[PDB]
Structure 1
Amino acid sequence: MKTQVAIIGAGPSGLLLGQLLHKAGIDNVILERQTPDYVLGRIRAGVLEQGMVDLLREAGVDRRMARDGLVHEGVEIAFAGQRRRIDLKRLSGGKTVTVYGQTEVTRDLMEAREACGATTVYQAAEVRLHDLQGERPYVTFERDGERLRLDCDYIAGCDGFHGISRQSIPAERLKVFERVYPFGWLGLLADTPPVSHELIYANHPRGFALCSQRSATRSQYYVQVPLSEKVEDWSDERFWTELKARLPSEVAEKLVTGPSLEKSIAPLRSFVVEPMQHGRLFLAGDAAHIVPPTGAKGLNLAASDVSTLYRLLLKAYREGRGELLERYSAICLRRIWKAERFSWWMTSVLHRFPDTDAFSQRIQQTELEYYLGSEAGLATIAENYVGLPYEEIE
């Protein structure tokens, strides 16, 4: 097989890069290890930044999002029994975020790629990368009993945290930065109406809690739990009871509870690798970094990495400026680090950390009061929450 850009992974990153490349007239092939239904089987929510929304539109995959997506002009943080609203729209001059699940976004992308007939090979096993530092790199994989080869000009590793692309880079060239948090998120998806039309991030002595929604008909709640907790030890009633206990009475009072469609505990971790490329190989999304869920920036960083790579690829193919691709990592990393910083900040002010002393507890409460009670503080949250502007190339 022969293509211009080989894409490893058919998740959000890979699908979005490929559709953008498709519309731009740049040949591309996506190799996915799992099956279409397997990828679609991963149920993930989502809070899309303006930048990602624009990118999806530019990709020609926004019809369903515009119809089913939920535009939020604000977000709330609860602490000390009070609800403090951050007017994102007003504080940013008009920017908003759109609540539309990653599952739906992935589905939309798969339908668009399937419809245009772009190349995608599902169940592509034993993917291996070759000659990355040459001008003729290629990928090998095994599908339906045979060994196939894919020659290309560039390779985009969009294969997630456990993909093969990051592992195909000599460890001596990479620098890893990571952090694991002393707690996880117990989540519960329900078909009951949300307790609020905007998300509610809550800080409470017993621990963190979040009131959100996956769609107009699906509610999603979370409560902080220690790392050793067993989802099985948490019945729906125990979850509802703990959740209400971490929210202001006015909110817990009008909350509608119901049987859980799904429940699980997710860890919170940070991971960043530098650089994010090697020769003709470029990493994007989870293959290059992980952020804690607190900022809902994971899906958004995947989008921005793809935007940068896509824009740099155009420069290479349409202006013979392939040298600019060398700046891919530095550009992405500047945004990735700010996103890691903001997620870290949100996580630190909202969660209960073990063995924390009186001073730390007081400082945390003061962080919330200062930031939510100051226009400048409110602005720092707003601009970060809606997403910082994508850095223009060069």
Structure 2
Amino acid sequence: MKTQVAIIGAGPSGLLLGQLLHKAGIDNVILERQTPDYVLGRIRAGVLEQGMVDLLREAGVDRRMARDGLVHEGVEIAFAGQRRRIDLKRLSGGKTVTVYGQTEVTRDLMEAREACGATTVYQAAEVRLHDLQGERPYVTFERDGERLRLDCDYIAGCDGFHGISRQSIPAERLKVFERVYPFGWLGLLADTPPVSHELIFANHPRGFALCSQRSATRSRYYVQVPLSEKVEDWSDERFWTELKARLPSEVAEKLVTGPSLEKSIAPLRSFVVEPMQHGRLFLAGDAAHIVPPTGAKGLNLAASDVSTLYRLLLKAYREGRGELLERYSAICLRRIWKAERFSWWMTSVLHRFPDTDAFSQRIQQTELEYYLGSEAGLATIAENYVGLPYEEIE
């Protein structure tokens, strides 16, 4: 079996890299462990950078997103009874963000890949990677019990945190940087109209809460919960009582509550590997780095990794400039580390930590009062929240 770029994973990273490449004429096969339904059941992301909106347009897959996606021009931060709105458009020089769920982006690309006839093997069990420093790397896997071989020029590991491709690099060639946080996010999806037309991130003594949305009639909410927590200890009513308690009263009062469609606990983690490549293997998205959800940067970082792997494989095939692929990691990590710092900063100023002495509680309150009350403070949150520019390539 033979292809030009083999892609491990049909989550948003693999599907969008696969789409862009097909449209430029560069053949590619996607391998996925799970069924299409398993992949589409994941709720994940809601906020999308303008940079990601332009890439879906470049890939020809924006009909529904331009239709149904919501453009947002501001977000709110609430702490100490105050609600302070950051006008993102005014403060970033006109950039805005787009709310469109991750299930929906993945569905659109799954549909778009099928129409155009590109190759996708779901239920590919036991994927293994071989001969990474050769000229002919290959991938082995099992489909319904029989072991097949796929031959390629290059491999793109787009398989998330627990994928096989970071594990397939000699660990001595990698440096891992990680922080695990002492809490998670209990998220709840409800078919109810949202409490506001923009998002409200909130700092509260009991811990963090988030008001987010999927459309005019579907909502996504999160509360901070300690790592001890089991999702079956949280009834829908237990969760709504607790969300109402962490919010400003004039906002908890008009909240339309309702039963969940989905309820899950996501642990928080910062994680980076350097370099993001080995021989003919290039890592993208969560295969290479994790951010805490607080900056809404994870999927937007997959997109820039993919936008950078695509433009370098294009120069490599169309222009024969195959040497430029050694720059993939140096270009991606400049962007990745600045988003890791924004995501860490948002996480330490909006959440409640364990054994936080009186002084750190007060510096945390003062970070929020300074960045929110200063034009220069407001602009650093804002240019980072809409998303810092994408690097030029050559």
CA distance in 2, matches of 1:110, 1:262: 22
Which residue is 1:312 aligned to?
312
Q: TM-score when scaled to structure 1?
A: 0.98
Q: How many residues align?
A: 394
Which residue is 2:156 aligned to?
156
CA distance in 1, matches of 2:37, 2:266: 22
Contact 1:6/1:28, CA 8 A, preserved across alignment: yes
Matched, 1:122 2:128: no
- Following TM superposition, by how much is the alpha carbon of 1:80 offset from its aligned partner in structure 2, in angstroms? 1.1
- Following TM superposition, by how much is the alpha carbon of 1:244 offset from its aligned partner in structure 2, in angstroms? 1.5
Percent of paired sites with the same residue: 99
- Following TM superposition, by how much is the alpha carbon of 1:278 offset from its aligned partner in structure 2, in angstroms? 0.2
- Following TM superposition, by how much is the alpha carbon of 1:262 offset from its aligned partner in structure 2, in angstroms? 2.1
CA distance in 2, matches of 1:148, 1:364: 55
Residue deviations 1:347-389 (CA, integer Å, cap 9, x gap) = 0000010111111111011101110111111110111101111
CA distance in 1, matches of 2:41, 2:230: 23
Contact 1:127/1:139, CA 8 A, preserved across alignment: yes
Which residue is 1:332 aligned to?
332
Contact 2:13/2:302, CA 8 A, preserved across alignment: yes
42-51 or 162-171: which moved more?
A: 42-51
Contact 1:46/1:299, CA 8 A, preserved across alignment: no
CA distance in 1, matches of 2:276, 2:43: 27
CA distance in 2, matches of 1:332, 1:376: 27
Residue deviations 1:176-235 (CA, integer Å, cap 9, x gap) = 111111111111111111100100000111111100012332111111111102222222
Residue deviations 1:54-92 (CA, integer Å, cap 9, x gap) = 001100000011111011011110011111111111111
Which residue is 2:55 aligned to?
55
CA distance in 1, matches of 2:97, 2:40: 23
164-173 or 217-226: which moved more?
A: 217-226
Which residue is 2:345 aligned to?
345
CA distance in 1, matches of 2:266, 2:147: 37
CA distance in 1, matches of 2:259, 2:318: 54
Which residue is 1:6 aligned to?
6
Which residue is 2:265 aligned to?
265
Residue deviations 1:224-267 (CA, integer Å, cap 9, x gap) = 11110222222222222221121111111211112222222211
CA distance in 1, matches of 2:38, 2:201: 31
Matched, 1:235 2:239: no
- Following TM superposition, by how much is the alpha carbon of 1:322 offset from its aligned partner in structure 2, in angstroms? 1.1
SS of the residue 2:95 aligns to: coil
36-45 or 222-231: which moved more?
A: 36-45
CA distance in 2, matches of 1:148, 1:87: 54
SS of the residue 1:341 aligns to: helix
CA distance in 2, matches of 1:155, 1:108: 24
- CA RMSD, 1 decimal: 1.1
CA distance in 2, matches of 1:359, 1:242: 27
Which residue is 2:170 aligned to?
170
Alignment of 1:68-83 (within 5 A): 68-83=68-83
Residue deviations 1:147-194 (CA, integer Å, cap 9, x gap) = 221111110000111111111100010111111111111111111111
CA distance in 1, matches of 2:208, 2:39: 30
Alignment of 1:15-26 (within 5 A): 15-26=15-26
CA distance in 2, matches of 1:159, 1:145: 22
CA distance in 2, matches of 1:308, 1:345: 26
Contact 1:45/1:214, CA 8 A, preserved across alignment: no
Contact 2:45/2:296, CA 8 A, preserved across alignment: no
258-267 or 170-179: which moved more?
A: 258-267
Contact 2:45/2:299, CA 8 A, preserved across alignment: no
SS of the residue 2:3 aligns to: coil
Contact 1:206/1:246, CA 8 A, preserved across alignment: yes
Contact 1:77/1:83, CA 8 A, preserved across alignment: yes
Contact 2:195/2:255, CA 8 A, preserved across alignment: yes
Contact 2:176/2:274, CA 8 A, preserved across alignment: yes
SS of the residue 1:261 aligns to: strand
- Following TM superposition, by how much is the alpha carbon of 1:129 offset from its aligned partner in structure 2, in angstroms? 0.9
CA distance in 1, matches of 2:150, 2:133: 16
CA distance in 1, matches of 2:64, 2:176: 38
Which residue is 1:113 aligned to?
113
- Following TM superposition, by how much is the alpha carbon of 1:145 offset from its aligned partner in structure 2, in angstroms? 3.2
172-181 or 239-248: which moved more?
A: 239-248
Do the aligned partners of residues 187 and 127 (structure 1) sit closer, same or farther apart at CA in structure 2, a change above 3 Å counting? same
CA distance in 1, matches of 2:85, 2:342: 18
Contact 2:159/2:287, CA 8 A, preserved across alignment: yes
SS of the residue 2:77 aligns to: strand
Residue deviations 1:80-131 (CA, integer Å, cap 9, x gap) = 1111111111111221111111110000000000000011111111211111
SS of the residue 1:245 aligns to: helix
SS of the residue 1:214 aligns to: strand
Which runs of 5 or more structure 1 residues have no equivalent in the other structure? none
CA distance in 2, matches of 1:127, 1:61: 29
SS of the residue 2:215 aligns to: coil
SS of the residue 1:113 aligns to: helix
SS of the residue 2:260 aligns to: coil
- Following TM superposition, by how much is the alpha carbon of 1:44 offset from its aligned partner in structure 2, in angstroms? 2.5
Residue deviations 1:270-289 (CA, integer Å, cap 9, x gap) = 11111110000000011111
CA distance in 2, matches of 1:146, 1:238: 48
Residue deviations 1:5-60 (CA, integer Å, cap 9, x gap) = 11111110000000000111111111111111221122233200000010011000
Q: TM-score when scaled to structure 2?
A: 0.98
